[PDB]
């Protein structure tokens with residue numbers, strides 16, 4: 010796979026085409042959070058926050074021995090098991106995505122972490138960097154990223170166009186039990202300051218924050234192929250906890266090297282754009298970043314840092330041209346969310362960021378199918394050619410973290426492919 | 429014939445029964461007696477002769493090595509930047525671990541109930557932790573829980589009935605009102621007792637495990653071979669450290685799955701009881717001269733954690749693939765040990781010192797001598813693991829009829845940073861060893 014990636018390397022330069030209308034995008038506009046999309050009826054006709062309506066459908070399916078919408082399970086025991094696996098997968102994730110910056114697991118400084126306090130006598134986080142060479146730092150930090158659970162890792166210069174204009178967060182002293190009821194907006198700004206810092210009014214990223222490190226965290230193929238049923242929910246969930254552990258591990262390594270690091274998971278900015286600029290893959294009709302190793306069946310997280318690094322080259326292995334004629338995801342999508350038309354610079358609704366050339370999809374239509382089906386769908390990922398019953402999954406092949414030994418050698422790494 | 433770990437385990441399976449041989453002087457072991465915690469072993473000199481808590485003396489040596497451009501004792505790094513990078517990797521590995529091992533029960537990550545966890549609160553409307561189990565069949569439960577264990581990062585997973593002999597008589601913990609920044613100064617002992625109660629519970633006086641807590645699930649978490657072979661230097665410390673955070677994630681993930689199936693679950697990592705003995709009884713491997721559990725897939729180069737539960741399960745069979753007989757003639761770890769902690773003599777029932785639990789047949793090692801080498805070397809050593817022939821990736825051969833051990837096996841850090849790596853430090857040349865189907869999860 011290291012041969013393929015260098016064969017398809019582009020010359021330097023962001024491959025996302027923009028016009029002069031593009032503005033940074035307020036995170037509150039996503040379908041998950043925006044008031045126009047947030048409330049959906051359950052199967053009884055009661056309007057609730059969308060994820061609560063989806064909970065009601067999970068309960069109804071368990072009671073009726075189903076693994077998904079009109080998908081009978083082997084028995085009620087099997088239906089329960091898939092939802093127990095899904096729920097457990099989310100253990101290391103706050104409120105579905107860890108999006109609040111500088112809260113809970115997503116701290117912008119390591120100073121208060123238990124690990125940092127235990128290691129304080131060594132002083133790694135206070136000691137100036139011993140390495141400033143971007144070539145050596147790129148090799149060190151990619152090695153560390155693989156130790157930290159990334160299946161893919163890439164580096165790009167930080168394009169501020171993809172950083173949210175304002176983040177969704179909670180006040181710093183609000184306890185977890187009131188968090189969902191007290192979400193607020195807060196601007197993300199760049200200023201001449203030494204370190205990332207949060208004031209009462211602003212999330213402040215330093216102007217020295219030059220780079221973003223993007224990780225790809227592979228999902229399980231057999232489980233995602235059960236979309237829109239529960240086992241596709243389970244591989245999604247487990248990878249969100251893998252994302253959180255990756256951010257914390259890598260931020261701690263970068264801090265202990267003498268630099269600062271900002272974790273993010275699903276917060277701070279748009280992962281698909283960063284992933285394309287870092288060379289992990291190409292944008293697609295469904296909207297995801299499609300990778301040569303995994304297609305779109307991979308989750309993304311990212312870390313921002315002033316650590317000197319060598320940016321990776323973007324890659325072109327023909328996704329744009331394949332998506333022009335394929336349209337399989339658009340035809341299988343249960344909610345008709347994915348367009349069959351051509352790419353434009355004009356968003357279809359508030360949930361899209363206008364000003365960038367992309368396939369414009371209706372993401373309120375997508376979210377609307379989640380309470381109906383009681384899961385996170387994923388049909389588009391499952392049917393995509395680049396990605397290539399539930400009892401057979403539970404009785405079938407599995408390996409550590411759901412990785413597959415039949416393909417795991419595609420992500421082996423030596424120095425030559427790290428820098 | 430190409431390697432097959434399921435075949436190897438089937439060939440060397442033994443009939444049911446704890447393989448560990450015990451006599452009448454066996455008593456449960458107070459966790460405070462470990463060398464990490466006991467007053468007789470806790471204090472060690474640093475390189476200036478100052479007597480400190482052992483891990484602070486080791487800190488002093490780490491700082492000294494970075495300043496002198498060293499990756500380990502008298503091992504020169506490429507430069508100071510490389511020395512710094514190895515210790516930064518090591519320190520970051522420990523991010524999801526409290527005070528080196530997560531040993532305090534029902535504190536921090538090791539909660540004995542899920543009710544207060546953020547994930548449980550988020551999922552409360554579904555009621556999975558309050559709904560009675562929909563499956564009580566131990567066969568199906570074993571398949572489900574082992575599948576979940578592999579999702580949760582276990583490279584090996586096994587089940588045994590819980591043997592209370594290996595549960596610590598008293599735990600090392602902290603009072604519930606002590607915050608993290610004073611934890612190291614306020615450690616106490618607290619008894620672990622078994623009583624007729626419905627759920628695991630902690631009182632001011634006791635940690636109470638229910639009499640219904642029938643089973644223990646043991647996980648192996650594979651370390652990286654290239655990094656451990658640098659023992660006693662810094663990169664061996666780093667693969668150790670990352671695997672402790674993997675252990676913690678495993679426990680939390682699996683306990684939540686078990687709870688959401690309608691049962692209770694107790695995490696432990698390095699706490700609650702003796703991992704090697706549980707691992708032997710659950711069939712992950714055999715005890716060895718060095719004292720670790722040696723597995724067919726990884727040798728001793730694998731970490732262990734375990735979860736206790738009332739969930740009905742099918743215990744696995746123990747395995748005997750000849751480790752005892754190899755250790756009887758090998759002695760490589762004993763001869764290479766930089767502190768001479770590992771005995772070259774026979775197994776006995778008599779502990780060498782307070783750190784050993786007497787009354788069980790094992791090789792008796794001086795674990796105060798081992799720990800004394802850690803401040804000297806600035807790390808967690810691991811030379812015994814590195815030199816053990818079972819840590820080699822290719823010890824197994826097939827003779828056309830069956831599998832056997834290759835007896836011939838018993839006769840630098842810059843290149844590691846520049847060399848092969850893959851997700852979580854796993855090795856794709858060997859990752860097929862741990863593929864799993866229903867047939868090898870439950871019989």
Ligand SMILES: Oc1ccc(Br)cc1Br
Nearest residue numbers: 041060105106245275385
């Ligand atoms: O990104 C997500 C946010 C919330 C839920 Br519920 C599922 C996903 Br996937």
Ligand SMILES: Oc1ccc(Br)cc1Br
Nearest residue numbers: 126127128129130481612
């Ligand atoms: O006295 C101490 C100071 C720092 C640490 Br880290 C541990 C102890 Br004990």
Ligand SMILES: Oc1ccc(Br)cc1Br
Nearest residue numbers: 464483528529668698808
């Ligand atoms: O088990 C351990 C406890 C403390 C340290 Br420091 C290292 C290990 Br390995």
Ligand SMILES: Oc1ccc(Br)cc1Br
Nearest residue numbers: 058189549550551552553
């Ligand atoms: O009102 C609520 C009740 C339970 C949960 Br979980 C989330 C909300 Br918002």
Ligand code: SF4
Nearest residue numbers: 342375386387388389
């Ligand atoms: S997740 Fe499902 S509903 Fe959403 S776009 Fe994909 S196929 Fe359509």
Ligand code: SF4
Nearest residue numbers: 294332335336338393
């Ligand atoms: S299914 Fe086809 S059109 Fe959709 S993202 Fe995949 S390749 Fe592109």
Ligand code: SF4
Nearest residue numbers: 765798809810811812
């Ligand atoms: S860790 Fe090192 S000092 Fe300890 S027993 Fe093994 S070889 Fe000896």
Ligand code: SF4
Nearest residue numbers: 717755758759761816
């Ligand atoms: S080095 Fe030899 S004696 Fe020591 S544990 Fe390994 S096989 Fe046994």
Ligand SMILES: [Br-]
Nearest residue numbers: 481612613615
């Ligand atoms: Br202490």
